[PDB]
């Protein structure tokens, strides 16, 4: 790790909620100093923005001074803004740079199109990762692009699995991995804004209800990372005959609890899918 | 470390296999120091407790002569039938500490108070996810419970997940929420996988995203001051994938089923101890 | 103490937009009502006769407001912007500030027409709603290709003079409507339903209707100046076990939040789909 | 200028709220008001510290400071209260019931087995009295002097709107303006959830939400108008405001609001029968 990292510098195009997230995460992990790590926004009068200033991370309002000064260099903006990005800061580009870009919906093939036409072979690699890299338990996929080195993906791997789960795919599943895991958090937190509603309706304070759910859905998220068995087995293993929790299954299944969760994924996948055709 | 502890199961079955298996992962208890009682000595919760090192018999009065702390950890309904079989041997030293769902201290205490004064008794609700260290446990203290006795629990329990006193009025809840939680956690990521295999992702990728989602979510609320609402617009950029999902979920009513789920788990609890006193 | 002393203001249409922004700008002491101009042509209409009374200059012609105005105001439906543009196109001049308050109308359009008759048209495009009567306005804007900095400056400090006032890049202001625009119209709708709802369990409908009003004032104001997310102000209601908590669940119950995600949605969509027949 | 001593039996959220409410009016100085709570460590209690409101963990104490008493615990604390404190209230007293379903009848009974005719009134308020936008109504009881409601609709009208009620209505008003900040509050979360989905900023979307509800809201109260015209007014034939009201009306909007209003106030309701 030491290799890959003593002397890597950082650089994020966009200073948002995603750049904050993998910049906290980094250092926290002690992977990166903060001072190797470089942000550019037009705006900087956000509030991720003062957070990275706070952690030691150099700011600057120009995107190409961010490219000079990186090595690995992530693309935190939103999908529409990348190609205008490329068109920017492509004649930039050098031999040196990974490109990482952390959209959805935008493909390998269309960054290097882009890029191919400022310089040949610009190494390029899609991440999808998802906010929770902030406290080290990040979901994240990554997918190598047609001129990627071989320490390109063992690389981005090793600097990924610091913050959490990282895993190589196809370039096809990416966007389905968003819709399940980079939307995951919103889905969790959804959910767990309303159980601790419901703690407060049956009588407890709200502060120790928010702690409880949340410490039950971590339990359990960790209980079947750690078991061989089938979630369905596992709920069994928690309903007794004719018990408190088997009643409460039920007016999940009534509500069609299970269906509203696959709406999510598809309808987040959808989405994307519409904004990638806007595009082209 | 608690060297000179000994510790009693009466009842052999998931939760003494989640709590054994914590406390032993923890240190906090070696192994042999622990005793597990049931009238099938074949169980696979038995087999499980077994290669772990926990002494097994089928006779609960010896896991009581053993015991120092005793977990009843029975069926709710088999509560009254173990409290008179053992009420006798009950001792000065002992703490009984009850995690069967929606028995009172109160009908623990009368049970235990016609063999002998002052017993000491602590009500726990727990779940589980202590087996990886991960439980969210909360206890209330009887009336003869001591000081030491409230904090010795909370040092146990604490090493395998969340510990924190309540008073007894709250602990129904508490079971509709943490106890019950983990099977809304499972069924959610059953779902939440099944969505992903829709949309093309191989079952066993989908089903480990779709977990490591919830627990770094869930960690990211744990670790923060801010509000869960706050943490959710972070994820949801405008006009953006994750918005658009959120819609759905709320056009299905999402949240009022978990509160739903919440309120049937508490209400059958509280249905269920109705009809025990009655 | 803001007074515009050489500024004479014209609206054409004397509708209920004329009338709410002639009414809050006079409230405010910021124009004279006799400095404000306003054409439609039914000289018989109910605003007409409000406007009248506030002192306010009135013709059935177009070109005589334009000619009297410095600060030109377009408060027409959507459909009669490209008619109007044709009648008075010949008549701006360089001192000409035009401010399209239509839903949906593209500077790029108003740009193209009245750049027909002479070119650097000054376009400001504004998002407003009907409470700047009570001077509560909610307001965004948007400078045209020829609107100087001081043009943006100047409706600014005239538009906040009567609630919320900010600028925006053009394309968020279909969504500003869909949220701010029709918004009051989800709030009466509310409101009449809060009331009905204190009616069935016994308040007299006078009572009903100001509580429920004062009450959804007190709450929009809490939260405009409290640094703290809705979710924790409704927290600080929702005692455990309590009246509240129970009712918070019959609305979560119903679908209550989608419904208002749906009517943004549904009024930003149409917004885009008149203009979109407009423009074809 | 009355220099009044204030107390509050309970150290939460609509302590707090009155509190900073009453402060900012200038009708009251933090220290003249005395707030007790057996749990010194909410974040409550450190905000009334941190304002200068003295703080005890005895109700005795609060009793004996105040000219004004308020009860501002849970309902099903009150008897409780009231048998703590019931010896220690005088003649000079009056006490302000805040609690959601308690009624005067059951408050007079308590005390009245101390002193003869205590002088109770009971109100009905809400949160944003922080902001001095609350939305008050308070009944008077047996022995309240005509004196005693005139000094409370003064006090309780320094941070929103007051009248004096019929007590019966008391548990209506709490499921409209009691609760009603709440489905504001839960309104305002939604909106801004919408405003993203189109594209807007959160932080905009959430401030122009409430801007939108707070002039509404404004304009109600300053026009004669029925709402139903003021939605009329903001209604063009054919365009965007209209079609979103469609789709509020297909999924019942209306009725949502009325069941939220008849749910706070059937609850309220079942809690008293239980106390009872
Ligand atoms: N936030 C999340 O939960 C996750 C986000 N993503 C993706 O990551 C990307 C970034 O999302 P967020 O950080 O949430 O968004 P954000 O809206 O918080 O941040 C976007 C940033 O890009 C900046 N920006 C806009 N135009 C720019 C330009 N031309 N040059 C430089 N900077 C520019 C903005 O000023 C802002 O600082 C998006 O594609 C999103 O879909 C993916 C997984 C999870
Ligand atoms: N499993 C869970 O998710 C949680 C369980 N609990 C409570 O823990 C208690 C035990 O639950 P589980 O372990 O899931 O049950 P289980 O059904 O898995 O195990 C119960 C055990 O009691 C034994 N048993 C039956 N009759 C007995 C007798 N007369 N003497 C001695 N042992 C006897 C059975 O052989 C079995 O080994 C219940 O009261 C439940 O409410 C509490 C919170 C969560
Ligand atoms: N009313 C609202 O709630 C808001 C309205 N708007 C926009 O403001 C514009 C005006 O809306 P309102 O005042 O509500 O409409 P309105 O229907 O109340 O008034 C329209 C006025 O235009 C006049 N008019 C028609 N043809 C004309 C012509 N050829 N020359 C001059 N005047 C003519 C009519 O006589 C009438 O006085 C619309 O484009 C609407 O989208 C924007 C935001 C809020
Ligand atoms: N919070 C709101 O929005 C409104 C609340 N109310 C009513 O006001 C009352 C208080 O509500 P909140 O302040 O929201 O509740 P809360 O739970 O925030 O405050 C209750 C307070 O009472 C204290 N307390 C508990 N037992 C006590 C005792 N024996 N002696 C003294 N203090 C004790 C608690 O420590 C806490 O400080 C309730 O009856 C509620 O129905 C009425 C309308 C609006």
């Given at each position: 790790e030491n290799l890959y990292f003593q002397s890597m510098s950082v650089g994020f195009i966009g200073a948002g909620q995603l750049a904050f997230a993998l910049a906290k995460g980094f250092t926290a992990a002690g992977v990166?100093?903060?001072?190797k790590i470089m942000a550019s926004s037009p705006?900087?009068?956000?509030a991720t923005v003062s957070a990275l200033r706070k952690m030691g991370v150099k700011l600057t309002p120009h995107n190409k001074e961010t490219v000079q000064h990186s090595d690995v260099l992530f693309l935190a903006v939103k999908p529409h803004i990348i190609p205008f990005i490329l068109d920017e800061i492509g004649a930039d580009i050098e031999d040196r740079h990974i490109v990482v870009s952390c959209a959805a919906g935008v493909t390998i093939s269309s960054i290097e199109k882009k890029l191919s036409a400022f310089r040949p072979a610009p190494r390029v690699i899609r991440c999808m990762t998802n906010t929770p890299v902030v406290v080290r338990e990040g979901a994240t996929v990554y997918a190598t692009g047609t001129?990627?080195?071989?320490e390109d993906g063992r690389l981005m791997e090793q600097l990924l699995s610091s913050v959490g789960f990282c895993t190589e795919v196809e370039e096809d599943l990416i966007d389905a991995v968003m819709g399940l895991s980079g939307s995951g958090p919103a889905y969790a937190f959804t959910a767990l804004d309303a159980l601790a509603d419901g703690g407060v309706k049956m009588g407890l304070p709200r502060r120790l209800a928010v702690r409880l759910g949340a410490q039950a859905l971590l339990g359990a998220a960790k209980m079947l990372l750690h078991s061989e068995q089938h979630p369905g087995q596992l709920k069994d293993n928690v309903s007794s005959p004719g018990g408190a929790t088997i009643h409460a299954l039920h007016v999940l299944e009534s509500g069609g609890f299970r269906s509203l969760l696959i709406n999510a994924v598809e309808a987040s996948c959808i989405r994307t899918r519409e904004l990638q055709s806007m595009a082209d």
């Amino acid at each position: 790790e030491n290799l890959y990292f003593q002397s890597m510098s950082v650089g994020f195009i966009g200073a948002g909620q995603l750049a904050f997230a993998l910049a906290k995460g980094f250092t926290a992990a002690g992977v990166l100093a903060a001072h190797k790590i470089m942000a550019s926004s037009p705006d900087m009068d956000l509030a991720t923005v003062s957070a990275l200033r706070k952690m030691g991370v150099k700011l600057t309002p120009h995107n190409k001074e961010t490219v000079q000064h990186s090595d690995v260099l992530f693309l935190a903006v939103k999908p529409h803004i990348i190609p205008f990005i490329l068109d920017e800061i492509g004649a930039d580009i050098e031999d040196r740079h990974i490109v990482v870009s952390c959209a959805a919906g935008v493909t390998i093939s269309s960054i290097e199109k882009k890029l191919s036409a400022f310089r040949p072979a610009p190494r390029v690699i899609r991440c999808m990762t998802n906010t929770p890299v902030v406290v080290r338990e990040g979901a994240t996929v990554y997918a190598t692009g047609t001129h990627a080195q071989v320490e390109d993906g063992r690389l981005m791997e090793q600097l990924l699995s610091s913050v959490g789960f990282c895993t190589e795919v196809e370039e096809d599943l990416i966007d389905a991995v968003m819709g399940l895991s980079g939307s995951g958090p919103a889905y969790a937190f959804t959910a767990l804004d309303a159980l601790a509603d419901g703690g407060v309706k049956m009588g407890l304070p709200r502060r120790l209800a928010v702690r409880l759910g949340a410490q039950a859905l971590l339990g359990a998220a960790k209980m079947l990372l750690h078991s061989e068995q089938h979630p369905g087995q596992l709920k069994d293993n928690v309903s007794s005959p004719g018990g408190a929790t088997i009643h409460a299954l039920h007016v999940l299944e009534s509500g069609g609890f299970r269906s509203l969760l696959i709406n999510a994924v598809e309808a987040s996948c959808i989405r994307t899918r519409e904004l990638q055709s806007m595009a082209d």
